[PDB]
Design a protein around this nucleic acid. Structure first.
Ligand SMILES: [Mg+2]
Ligand SMILES: [Mg+2]
Ligand SMILES: [Mg+2]
Ligand SMILES: [Mg+2]
Ligand SMILES: [Mg+2]
Ligand SMILES: [Mg+2]
Ligand SMILES: [Mg+2]
Ligand SMILES: [Mg+2]
Ligand SMILES: [Mg+2]
Ligand SMILES: [Mg+2]
Ligand SMILES: [Mg+2]
Ligand SMILES: [Mg+2]
Ligand SMILES: [Mg+2]
Ligand SMILES: [Mg+2]
Ligand SMILES: [Mg+2]
Ligand SMILES: [Mg+2]
Ligand SMILES: [Mg+2]
Ligand SMILES: [Mg+2]
Ligand SMILES: [Mg+2]
Ligand SMILES: [Mg+2]
Ligand SMILES: [Mg+2]
Ligand SMILES: [Mg+2]
Ligand SMILES: [Mg+2]
Ligand SMILES: [Mg+2]
Ligand SMILES: [Mg+2]
Ligand SMILES: [Mg+2]
Ligand SMILES: [Mg+2]
Ligand SMILES: [Mg+2]
Ligand SMILES: [Mg+2]
Ligand SMILES: [Mg+2]
Ligand SMILES: [Mg+2]
Ligand SMILES: [Mg+2]
Ligand SMILES: [Mg+2]
Ligand SMILES: [Mg+2]
Ligand SMILES: [Mg+2]
Ligand SMILES: [Mg+2]
Ligand SMILES: [Mg+2]
Ligand SMILES: [Mg+2]
Ligand SMILES: [Mg+2]
Ligand SMILES: [Mg+2]
Lengths: 46, 271
RNA sequence: AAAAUGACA
RNA sequence: AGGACCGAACCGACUAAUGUUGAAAAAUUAGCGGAUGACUUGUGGCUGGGGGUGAAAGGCCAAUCAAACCGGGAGAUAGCU
RNA sequence: GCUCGCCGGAAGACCAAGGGUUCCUGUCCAACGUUAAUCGGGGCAGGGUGAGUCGACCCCUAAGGCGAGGCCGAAAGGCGUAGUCGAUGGGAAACAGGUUAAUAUUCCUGUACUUGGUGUUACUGCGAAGGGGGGACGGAGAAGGCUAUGUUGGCCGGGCGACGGUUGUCCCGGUUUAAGCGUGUAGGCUGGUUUUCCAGGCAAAUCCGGAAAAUCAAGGCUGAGGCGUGAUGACGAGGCACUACGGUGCUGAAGCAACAAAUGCCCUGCUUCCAGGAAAAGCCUCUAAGCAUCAGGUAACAUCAAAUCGUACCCCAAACCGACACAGGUGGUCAGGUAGAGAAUACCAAGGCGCUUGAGAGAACUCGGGUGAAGGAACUAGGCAAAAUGGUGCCGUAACUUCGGGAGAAGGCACGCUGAUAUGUAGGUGAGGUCCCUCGCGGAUGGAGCUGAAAUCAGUCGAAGAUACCAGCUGGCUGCAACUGUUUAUUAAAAACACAGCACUGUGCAAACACGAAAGUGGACGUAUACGGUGUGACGCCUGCCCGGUGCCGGGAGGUUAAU
RNA sequence: AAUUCCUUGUCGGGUAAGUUCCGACCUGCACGAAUGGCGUAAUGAUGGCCAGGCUGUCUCCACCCGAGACUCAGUGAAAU
RNA sequence: GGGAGGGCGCUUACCACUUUGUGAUUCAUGACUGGGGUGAAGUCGUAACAAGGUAACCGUAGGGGAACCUGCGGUUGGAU
RNA sequence: CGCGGGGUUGAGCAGCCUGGUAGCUCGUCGGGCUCAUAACCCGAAGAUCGUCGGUCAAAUCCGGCCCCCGCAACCA
């Protein structure tokens, strides 16, 4: 059975990557919420 | 030539092909080809605006010369060719000076005929000259609307336009649709009538024949659910509604023209 | 203008 | 030549049995339909919620769809338990 | 360690995606392992990934994203030009053998190859954001020539049989060699060379393009495979001693021919068809401005540089996606023997495994299977399930029909082995000679050897010769749907949806329609033989009457009627 | 009749017996002409009925080979 | 001593009864149904024979309770 | 067995609509044209409003009785 999560590093960084957040104002308020919360690793970027 | 295929398979019974031996069966002239990318009916927003488009066969657009802005310079037809972008076959034209181009092929043009454009050209099929010089009552095609535009009337396969009257600086044209327009007399019009007249007499025969032309299936309204289409609903084929487009506008009779800017050039509406 | 029909012996 | 025939890979899911605190949050076994096409598959893109897409079932949109998920209005309101 | 059993188009070997030390040694069994464990993909400590040629990086682009100015928009912001990014595509080069516990086209041995800088020499007009060529492209099909590879014969080395024979038409093993360089074949493409002229390729042009004249019947391009060289080299069965008893150390014979043969190569070829089958750069060439000393261009010689990142390990699974060491899911490449049409199926080689609880007994009952007396659907909602047919060749085959079908209709007959025809035929392949040769990888003649169907006659064994796996049940009447297809992932695969066909209706191009407060885009780089909406659903014979109602269209007199 | 309530309408065929099936009648509660009428060769994991072959589906169960169930040693759940 | 040859028997080939599977042709029979014929003062009309009161007829198509009507082309075997 | 429309000279259909007023067509009867029948012309009769009951008065208002014609009898 084909499951929902089929990994792909390239597809992950183009969508939820750091430069994907910074490119849009909504995606820039996303980072500010994480920084205010104090999260260890900001977006996804291993 | 119309050829009806022998029924050797359930799905080839009703196939009627149109075959033309004169068409060149090699490859199109390379320096007159471009890249033609399909869309599937999507626009900037990525949403479908026109339905039933997608799939088919890859095609390559050929730069056809519609303006015909080469006065004098007699030219010879080299070969007839099949154009996937249009409904009428094209013709490769080699001008005397050595330049090659493409034109639409009138029904009376062979491989080796001679054409020439300009205001001094002879009155023969394939010549282009303004309707100021074209004699009244003639049958023409590739009619221009504005001087130098390129041509927008009678460009499909087998159509023609009749020059009815010449009122001063204007010319009245009877079109295929039945309308009678008025155009400026200074517009060009390639003389003759477009070829490939047997284009009607061709039945695709099977679903795949339509599918490999970029025509997706269409679904009737009465099968739809009431959310998806105004017809919708029903316990076993109930209609009880006035026929309408999916967006509520009434079809089957309702006129939908409103221009108020080109009405000055309409003499008698289609009927 | 309308003007149909009449067993056999 | 064939949206031609029989039949493997490949795709799909018509019948029966088992399994129903399963080996498996839809599978195994024995049979079954297509198998040069309107086929099938790898990689990368586009379409965003009263919206997308739909060979049209109200189907699919991350095990969730007659209106997704997350946070906020919000300790919404409950003549009812 | 010796037996046994399983897979063998996989349960073998190599990658990509993905994972991140799981790889290799030493050590430990508290926890993890559905049991114990001395073992592990577990804990601990140490070791291991070596590149001018493999990839990444890099040059160029597709879908597409971002987008200086710009257009539009209450604010955020939307679209888009110049450009710049974006592989799943195009662009230079390395192969054998050896070596580690773990790496190797990376280390060593041998032999090569590509693009740049600088220098010397010899000639020389070089010169671009621009022009031209080329890169550069579909589906089916058909043979022809080869190779991978296999079988057999020859040669070499070894053996003389645990029990009847086995010095022979006897048994076992080996018989390998690359990249590169040279020759250029089977084949496939185009006629070539010279002179003159010009409305084209925005400028220019010696290049493409176009028009003539003369000349010669030839040239040029592409091209698998084969043959030399690399290679008096490496490899090689085995023989020789220590055995750290794991292997290491030493030497090394033959190393050919015939036949069969691909889905692989010539093939980006040829034939044919309609649904008419990417872009740019590298590369070749042409000139502009500019320089005619230069600078730069071509050829040979010498030297230098080729940086940085990945390189272990699993990759159809115990290491990836499924909460698990889960009967599930995952793209590409390789394809041995026998029987077989075959990648099906049966047994095997290389290679890998026996699936992480076992030992007993042989009750009911459940699951998976084998056989059955007589009857043969009597069971039941229903022949559900089981049973049955099943291959090649030949004879033969109805009603109906759109003349294609129905049809594998139905129903039958032959099928092993031996010998002869023929000490193996028909056919295929083709060696010695033999002649000619534009003299070469040449053209006939030539039939040694190798290979090998199919059919008849006679005989023979069995109860049974398509013997095992594999492998149609068949007819008759009828409704719906013309047909091939699609649908409720996860209780409905159908009579439902679609479909080619028909009709109504709108749409004259800045088209109707649709997405958007707008700019703008799809429609379409299409133009009424076109496009959108609606209903019906092949084909045949057809489609009657009603405009009173509700809608649509046309009319413009008269009544009623808004803002101002 | 995919439409017919009365209805298992009536007649005929097939069966020893046929509410289903095929043919006909017309008394169409409440068929009908592109929300198409009537036919139709081929096709169908489509609905209904019939016949040949075949058999554990059945009269009516009997025997046998494996995996569990049962005993021993180890580890060791769940609903309520 | 036996030999040659024959016979009994076994086997092969040809073939008649017989059993299958498909058709072809012909004779009876069949719910219902098309047309034809005869028959009694039946019902509806009056198509034709006179210019039969719209001249008749021929081929074809459409329509209608029935004779028939109309369209299209053709004939005189039509009266004044 | 709940709710409805209707019963009118021989047949079909109005008049019940806010209570006094019974009409149309066909048909029947007697005369008339014709040899005669149809067709046509001229004239007449024909019902007390299904029945049984309840305001000056009832086909009309009301109730029961009789008949016919319709609709609905549903969710499990
Ligand atoms: Mg539906
Ligand atoms: Mg609606
Ligand atoms: Mg209905
Ligand atoms: Mg097929
Ligand atoms: Mg098949
Ligand atoms: Mg879901
Ligand atoms: Mg809502
Ligand atoms: Mg509130
Ligand atoms: Mg609350
Ligand atoms: Mg085996
Ligand atoms: Mg670890
Ligand atoms: Mg343990
Ligand atoms: Mg470890
Ligand atoms: Mg943009
Ligand atoms: Mg800007
Ligand atoms: Mg780039
Ligand atoms: Mg790539
Ligand atoms: Mg390794
Ligand atoms: Mg490795
Ligand atoms: Mg799970
Ligand atoms: Mg396990
Ligand atoms: Mg697994
Ligand atoms: Mg197999
Ligand atoms: Mg047992
Ligand atoms: Mg059995
Ligand atoms: Mg036995
Ligand atoms: Mg039995
Ligand atoms: Mg028996
Ligand atoms: Mg019974
Ligand atoms: Mg029974
Ligand atoms: Mg079976
Ligand atoms: Mg179907
Ligand atoms: Mg199908
Ligand atoms: Mg299903
Ligand atoms: Mg339909
Ligand atoms: Mg109609
Ligand atoms: Mg239909
Ligand atoms: Mg508990
Ligand atoms: Mg008469
Ligand atoms: Mg007459």
């Amino acid at each position: 059975m084909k499951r929902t999560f089929q990994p792909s590093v390239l597809k992950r960084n183009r969508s939820h990557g750091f430069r994907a957040r910074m490119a849009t104002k909504n995606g820039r308020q996303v980072l500010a919420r994480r920084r205010a919360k104090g999260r260890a690793r900001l977006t996804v970027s291993k | 030539a119309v050829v009806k295929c022998k029924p050797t398979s359930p799905g080839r019974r009703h196939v009627v092909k149109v075959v033309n031996p004169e068409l060149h069966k090699g490859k199109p002239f390379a320096p007159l080809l471009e890249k033609n990318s399909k869309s599937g009916g999507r626009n900037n927003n990525g949403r479908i605006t026109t339905r039933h488009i997608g799939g088919g066969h890859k095609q390559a657009y050929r730069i056809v010369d519609f303006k015909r802005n080469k006065d004098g310079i007699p030219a010879v037809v080299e070969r007839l060719e099949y154009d996937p972008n249009r409904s009428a076959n094209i013709a490769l034209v080699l001008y005397k000076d050595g330049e090659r181009r493409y034109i639409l092929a009138p029904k009376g043009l062979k491989a080796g005929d001679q054409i020439q454009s300009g205001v001094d050209a002879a009155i023969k099929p394939g010549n282009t000259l303004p309707m100021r010089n074209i004699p009244v009552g003639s049958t023409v095609h590739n009619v221009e609307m504005k001087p130098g535009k390129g041509g927008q009337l009678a460009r499909s396969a087998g159509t023609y336009v009749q020059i009815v009257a010449r009122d001063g600086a204007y010319v009245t044209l009877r079109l295929r649709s039945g309308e009678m327009r008025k155009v400026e007399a200074d517009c060009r019009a390639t003389l003759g009538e477009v070829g490939n007249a047997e284009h009607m007499l061709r039945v695709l025969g099977k679903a795949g024949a339509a599918r490999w032309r970029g025509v997706r299936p269409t679904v009737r309204g009465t099968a739809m659910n009431p959310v998806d289409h105004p017809h919708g609903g029903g316990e076993g084929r109930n209609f009880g509604k006035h026929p309408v487009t999916p967006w509520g506008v009434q079809t089957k009779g309702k006129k939908t023209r409103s221009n108020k800017r080109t009405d000055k050039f309409i003499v008698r509406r289609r009927s």
